[PDB]
Design a protein around this motif. Structure first.
Motif, PDB file in Angstrom:
ATOM      1  N   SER A   7      50.750 -15.763  -1.570  1.00 56.98           N
ATOM      2  CA  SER A   7      51.455 -17.031  -1.391  1.00 56.98           C
ATOM      3  C   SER A   7      51.951 -17.739  -2.652  1.00 56.98           C
ATOM      4  CB  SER A   7      50.727 -17.945  -0.399  1.00 56.98           C
ATOM      5  OG  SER A   7      49.393 -18.287  -0.757  1.00 56.98           O
ATOM      6  N   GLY A   8      53.259 -17.640  -2.872  1.00 55.00           N
ATOM      7  CA  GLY A   8      53.888 -18.350  -3.974  1.00 55.00           C
ATOM      8  C   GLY A   8      54.164 -17.500  -5.197  1.00 55.00           C
ATOM      9  N   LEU A   9      53.551 -16.324  -5.249  1.00 52.21           N
ATOM     10  CA  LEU A   9      53.629 -15.482  -6.429  1.00 52.21           C
ATOM     11  C   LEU A   9      54.692 -14.416  -6.229  1.00 52.21           C
ATOM     12  CD1 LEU A   9      50.808 -16.884  -6.749  1.00 52.21           C
ATOM     13  CD2 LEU A   9      50.066 -14.791  -7.861  1.00 52.21           C
ATOM     14  N   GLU A  10      55.328 -14.070  -7.341  1.00 54.98           N
ATOM     15  CA  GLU A  10      56.303 -12.985  -7.394  1.00 54.98           C
ATOM     16  C   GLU A  10      55.647 -11.606  -7.402  1.00 54.98           C
ATOM     17  OE1 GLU A  10      55.707 -15.024  -9.979  1.00 54.98           O
ATOM     18  OE2 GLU A  10      57.298 -16.523  -9.983  1.00 54.98           O
ATOM     19  N   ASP A  11      54.373 -11.598  -7.778  1.00 55.02           N
ATOM     20  CA  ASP A  11      53.639 -10.372  -8.005  1.00 55.02           C
ATOM     21  C   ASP A  11      53.426  -9.578  -6.727  1.00 55.02           C
ATOM     22  OD1 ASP A  11      51.877  -8.463  -9.371  1.00 55.02           O
ATOM     23  OD2 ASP A  11      50.199  -9.627  -8.496  1.00 55.02           O
ATOM     24  N   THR A  12      54.011  -8.394  -6.724  1.00 57.28           N
ATOM     25  CA  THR A  12      53.876  -7.484  -5.600  1.00 57.28           C
ATOM     26  C   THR A  12      52.697  -6.562  -5.911  1.00 57.28           C
ATOM     27  OG1 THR A  12      56.299  -7.526  -5.298  1.00 57.28           O
ATOM     28  CG2 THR A  12      55.191  -5.770  -4.231  1.00 57.28           C
ATOM     29  N   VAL A  13      51.732  -6.562  -5.004  1.00 55.16           N
ATOM     30  CA  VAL A  13      50.591  -5.663  -5.050  1.00 55.16           C
ATOM     31  C   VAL A  13      50.873  -4.496  -4.111  1.00 55.16           C
ATOM     32  CG1 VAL A  13      48.083  -5.519  -4.565  1.00 55.16           C
ATOM     33  CG2 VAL A  13      49.066  -7.663  -5.376  1.00 55.16           C
ATOM     34  N   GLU A  14      50.606  -3.293  -4.602  1.00 51.02           N
ATOM     35  CA  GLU A  14      50.707  -2.091  -3.786  1.00 51.02           C
ATOM     36  C   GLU A  14      49.296  -1.643  -3.408  1.00 51.02           C
ATOM     37  OE1 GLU A  14      53.463  -2.387  -6.016  1.00 51.02           O
ATOM     38  OE2 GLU A  14      54.454  -2.576  -4.075  1.00 51.02           O
ATOM     39  N   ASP A  15      49.195  -1.106  -2.206  1.00 51.91           N
ATOM     40  CA  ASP A  15      47.981  -0.484  -1.712  1.00 51.91           C
ATOM     41  C   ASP A  15      48.322   0.655  -0.767  1.00 51.91           C
ATOM     42  OD1 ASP A  15      45.206  -0.110  -1.891  1.00 51.91           O
ATOM     43  OD2 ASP A  15      44.779  -1.536  -0.296  1.00 51.91           O
ATOM     44  N   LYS A  16      47.363   1.544  -0.548  1.00 49.82           N
ATOM     45  CA  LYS A  16      47.581   2.686   0.322  1.00 49.82           C
ATOM     46  C   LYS A  16      46.287   3.190   0.953  1.00 49.82           C
ATOM     47  CE  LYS A  16      48.588   6.049  -3.430  1.00 49.82           C
ATOM     48  NZ  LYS A  16      49.704   6.780  -4.054  1.00 49.82           N
ATOM     49  N   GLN A  17      46.435   3.789   2.130  1.00 47.80           N
ATOM     50  CA  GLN A  17      45.353   4.430   2.871  1.00 47.80           C
ATOM     51  C   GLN A  17      45.827   5.795   3.330  1.00 47.80           C
ATOM     52  OE1 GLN A  17      42.773   2.132   5.664  1.00 47.80           O
ATOM     53  NE2 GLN A  17      44.141   0.439   5.224  1.00 47.80           N
ATOM     54  N   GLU A  18      44.958   6.784   3.197  1.00 49.62           N
ATOM     55  CA  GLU A  18      45.229   8.106   3.731  1.00 49.62           C
ATOM     56  C   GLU A  18      44.724   8.211   5.171  1.00 49.62           C
ATOM     57  OE1 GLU A  18      44.682  11.643   1.071  1.00 49.62           O
ATOM     58  OE2 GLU A  18      43.146  12.078   2.567  1.00 49.62           O
ATOM     59  N   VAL A  19      45.618   8.635   6.047  1.00 47.07           N
ATOM     60  CA  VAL A  19      45.346   8.829   7.462  1.00 47.07           C
ATOM     61  C   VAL A  19      45.275  10.329   7.725  1.00 47.07           C
ATOM     62  CG1 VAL A  19      46.604   8.608   9.712  1.00 47.07           C
ATOM     63  CG2 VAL A  19      46.377   6.643   8.200  1.00 47.07           C
ATOM     64  N   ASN A  20      44.236  10.763   8.426  1.00 43.22           N
ATOM     65  CA  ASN A  20      44.173  12.109   8.990  1.00 43.22           C
ATOM     66  C   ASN A  20      44.264  11.946  10.505  1.00 43.22           C
ATOM     67  OD1 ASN A  20      43.086  14.650  10.058  1.00 43.22           O
ATOM     68  ND2 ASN A  20      41.886  14.929   8.217  1.00 43.22           N
ATOM     69  N   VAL A  21      45.186  12.668  11.141  1.00 42.89           N
ATOM     70  CA  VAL A  21      45.301  12.669  12.608  1.00 42.89           C
ATOM     71  C   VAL A  21      45.105  14.041  13.233  1.00 42.89           C
ATOM     72  CG1 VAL A  21      46.390  10.424  12.969  1.00 42.89           C
ATOM     73  CG2 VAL A  21      47.856  12.412  12.567  1.00 42.89           C
ATOM     74  N   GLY A  22      44.547  14.965  12.460  1.00 45.15           N
ATOM     75  CA  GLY A  22      44.106  16.204  13.061  1.00 45.15           C
ATOM     76  C   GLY A  22      45.260  17.154  13.273  1.00 45.15           C
ATOM     77  N   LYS A  23      45.277  17.766  14.443  1.00 46.84           N
ATOM     78  CA  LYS A  23      46.318  18.698  14.822  1.00 46.84           C
ATOM     79  C   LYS A  23      46.991  18.219  16.110  1.00 46.84           C
ATOM     80  CE  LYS A  23      43.794  22.769  12.973  1.00 46.84           C
ATOM     81  NZ  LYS A  23      44.781  23.238  11.990  1.00 46.84           N
ATOM     82  N   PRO A  24      47.974  17.309  16.055  1.00 47.56           N
ATOM     83  CA  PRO A  24      48.591  16.777  17.263  1.00 47.56           C
ATOM     84  C   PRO A  24      49.488  17.769  17.979  1.00 47.56           C
ATOM     85  CG  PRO A  24      49.627  15.779  15.309  1.00 47.56           C
ATOM     86  CD  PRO A  24      48.509  16.712  14.831  1.00 47.56           C
ATOM     87  N   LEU A  25      49.483  17.664  19.304  1.00 46.24           N
ATOM     88  CA  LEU A  25      50.389  18.419  20.162  1.00 46.24           C
ATOM     89  C   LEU A  25      50.188  19.926  19.990  1.00 46.24           C
ATOM     90  CD1 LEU A  25      53.501  16.036  20.182  1.00 46.24           C
ATOM     91  CD2 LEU A  25      51.579  15.983  21.734  1.00 46.24           C
ATOM     92  N   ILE A  26      51.270  20.704  19.884  1.00 49.33           N
ATOM     93  CA  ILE A  26      51.149  22.172  19.815  1.00 49.33           C
ATOM     94  C   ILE A  26      50.462  22.667  18.532  1.00 49.33           C
ATOM     95  CG2 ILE A  26      53.404  22.752  18.749  1.00 49.33           C
ATOM     96  CD1 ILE A  26      52.183  24.395  21.996  1.00 49.33           C
ATOM     97  N   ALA A  27      50.352  21.792  17.528  1.00 50.83           N
ATOM     98  CA  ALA A  27      49.647  22.118  16.293  1.00 50.83           C
ATOM     99  C   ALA A  27      48.183  22.469  16.496  1.00 50.83           C
ATOM    100  CB  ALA A  27      49.743  20.985  15.288  1.00 50.83           C
ATOM    101  N   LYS A  28      47.601  21.954  17.578  1.00 49.61           N
ATOM    102  CA  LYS A  28      46.252  22.301  18.007  1.00 49.61           C
ATOM    103  C   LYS A  28      45.991  23.791  18.212  1.00 49.61           C
ATOM    104  CE  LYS A  28      42.209  20.288  19.148  1.00 49.61           C
ATOM    105  NZ  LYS A  28      41.278  21.426  19.056  1.00 49.61           N
ATOM    106  N   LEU A  29      47.027  24.544  18.587  1.00 48.70           N
ATOM    107  CA  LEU A  29      46.876  25.991  18.761  1.00 48.70           C
ATOM    108  C   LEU A  29      46.597  26.730  17.460  1.00 48.70           C
ATOM    109  CD1 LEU A  29      49.707  26.825  21.306  1.00 48.70           C
ATOM    110  CD2 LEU A  29      47.351  26.162  21.754  1.00 48.70           C
ATOM    111  N   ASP A  30      47.093  26.168  16.363  1.00 48.48           N
ATOM    112  CA  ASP A  30      46.828  26.678  15.028  1.00 48.48           C
ATOM    113  C   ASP A  30      47.294  28.112  14.839  1.00 48.48           C
ATOM    114  OD1 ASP A  30      46.120  26.699  12.327  1.00 48.48           O
ATOM    115  OD2 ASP A  30      43.939  26.482  12.688  1.00 48.48           O
ATOM    116  N   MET A  31      48.517  28.359  15.278  1.00 51.89           N
ATOM    117  CA  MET A  31      48.973  29.722  15.501  1.00 51.89           C
ATOM    118  C   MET A  31      49.933  30.220  14.435  1.00 51.89           C
ATOM    119  SD  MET A  31      47.924  31.845  17.776  1.00 51.89           S
ATOM    120  CE  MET A  31      49.370  32.864  18.084  1.00 51.89           C
ATOM    121  N   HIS A  32      50.114  29.460  13.364  1.00 56.42           N
ATOM    122  CA  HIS A  32      50.994  29.870  12.262  1.00 56.42           C
ATOM    123  C   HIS A  32      50.659  31.230  11.640  1.00 56.42           C
ATOM    124  CE1 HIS A  32      48.075  29.030   9.026  1.00 56.42           C
ATOM    125  NE2 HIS A  32      47.555  28.090   9.784  1.00 56.42           N
ATOM    126  N   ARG A  33      51.689  31.890  11.102  1.00 61.36           N
ATOM    127  CA  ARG A  33      51.496  33.014  10.184  1.00 61.36           C
ATOM    128  C   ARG A  33      50.666  32.629   8.957  1.00 61.36           C
ATOM    129  NH1 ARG A  33      53.378  37.737  10.690  1.00 61.36           N
ATOM    130  NH2 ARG A  33      55.291  38.385  11.817  1.00 61.36           N
TER     131      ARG A  33
END
Ligand SMILES: C[C@@]1(C(F)(F)F)CN(C(=O)Nc2cnc(-n3nccn3)c(Cl)c2)c2cnc3cc(Cl)nn3c21
Ligand SMILES: [Ca+2]
Ligand SMILES: [Ca+2]
Ligand SMILES: [Ca+2]
Ligand SMILES: [Ca+2]
Ligand SMILES: [Ca+2]
Ligand SMILES: [Ca+2]
Ligand SMILES: [Ca+2]
Length: 373
Positions: free
Chosen positions: A347-373
């Protein structure tokens, strides 16, 4: 008597993003709208976009494994095809130029495998773009009795005429064919395509020992382990991750939500859902996607889903978010790990703070089969 289905299964493939061949656009819409139709008729549907040879062969083989006595099976392909000596071929997106039969899936072999089953109904529908001068060859007929089969084969000569004839929504040739010819009227409540220039063809062939329809009821079981297997195998290839409320250290809450567009395409979306009174401004974005998924940042973080290339319109998703389309999910090797970033100002400051979080969502949809070469 009344014809019944043992089960209702479908596989729909749309190839567009060809590497060595001209890119197509039409398949996306037509796969989606046919998926939506078949889903309302009680089919379990797999819908896949942009498949390589390996991916296509695994997909079709495992579809053919679901075909058994009494099962109703529908296979649909849209994308580039070719023809040589009566044999027709579906071309994967990784195919070299020129086409070779080793790199492509042959239509007639799939047709012969389907008719070797004691299915109650086989439907195989091909919507091919051919090369301009690739007409049907002069052939003898050298090598369709008890099998119930509906085979449909549409062609346009060249990508120009293909995309022209396929322009419009809701107007797919085979969707019109199925609605007009294969649905019995009052059994279901379901929710012009002008002839354009160029050279085109449609062939439809059928052999049925008795009247069959896509609206024929499934023979219902209360206690079948086979029905359970069938349902569970499909359903566990179609799990989305739940919506996440991501709480950042400063007190900002970003909600992260998920939608399925295809079996191999997920939309993700972000919105700020609490900003604390200390903070006057914030914004959030997603980044750091696995390299196997091949995400272009210019198609990510967009302020309508339409801008990502999605079928899903602004009415179909929660409004006022940033949307990202994660395609190619079948190529995921490990987990879908990505990063959600937050930018904020106190509030009131020009200073932009950056932050980040890493999300893991597993193997969604057909990725669950894990069938890649
Ligand atoms: C049982 C599955 C399932 F998806 F539901 F699990 C399995 N299957 C596949 O398509 N499987 C598949 C396997 N491997 C790959 N792949 N990706 C990278 C490398 N190999 C790909 Cl793309 C697809 C099909 C196809 N049609 C249908 C129709 C119904 Cl119903 N189920 N069904 C299925
Ligand atoms: Ca129903
Ligand atoms: Ca090969
Ligand atoms: Ca030819
Ligand atoms: Ca269309
Ligand atoms: Ca009973
Ligand atoms: Ca793996
Ligand atoms: Ca700073």
């Amino acid at each position: 008597d009344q014809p019944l289905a043992k089960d209702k299964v479908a596989l729909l493939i749309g190839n567009m993003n060809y590497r060595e061949h001209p890119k197509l656009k039409a398949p996306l819409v037509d796969v989606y709208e046919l998926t939506n139709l078949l889903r309302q008729l009680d089919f379990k549907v797999v819908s896949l976009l942009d498949l390589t040879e390996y991916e296509m062969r695994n997909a079709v083989d495992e579809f053919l494994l679901l075909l058994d006595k009494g099962v109703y099976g529908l296979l649909y392909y849209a994308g580039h095809g070719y023809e040589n000596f009566g044999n027709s071929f579906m071309v994967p997106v990784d195919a070299p130029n020129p086409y070779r039969s080793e790199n492509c899936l042959c239509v007639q072999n799939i047709l012969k495998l389907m008719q070797e089953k004691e299915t109650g109904l086989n439907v195989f529908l091909l919507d091919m773009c051919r090369k301009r001068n690739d007409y049907d060859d002069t052939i003898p007929i050298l090598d369709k009795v008890t099998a119930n089969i509906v085979f449909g084969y549409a062609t346009c000569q060249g990508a120009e005429a293909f995309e022209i004839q396929h322009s419009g929504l809701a107007n797919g040739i085979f969707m019109k064919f199925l609605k007009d010819r294969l649905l019995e009227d009052k059994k279901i409540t379901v929710l012009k395509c002008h002839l354009t220039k160029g050279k085109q063809a449609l062939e439809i062939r059928s052999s049925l020992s008795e009247k069959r329809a896509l609206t024929d009821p499934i023979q219902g079981t209360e206690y079948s382990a086979e029905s359970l297997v069938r349902n569970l195998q499909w359903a566990k290839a179609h799990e989305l991750p739940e919506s996440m409320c991501l709480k950042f250290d400063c007190g900002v809450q970003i909600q992260l939500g998920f939608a399925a567009e295809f079996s191999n395409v997920m939309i993700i979306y972000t919105s700020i859902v609490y900003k604390p009174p200390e903070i006057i401004m914030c914004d959030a974005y997603v980044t750091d996607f696995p390299l196997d998924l091949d995400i272009d940042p210019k198609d990510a973080n967009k302020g309508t889903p339409e801008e990502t290339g999605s079928y899903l319109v602004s009415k179909d998703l929660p409004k006022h978010c940033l949307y990202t389309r994660l395609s190619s999910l079948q190529k995921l090797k490990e987990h879908l790990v990505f990063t959600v970033c937050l930018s904020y100002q106190y509030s009131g400051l020009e200073d932009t703070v950056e932050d980040k979080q890493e999300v893991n969502v597993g193997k969604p949809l057909i990725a669950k089969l894990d069938m890649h070469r």
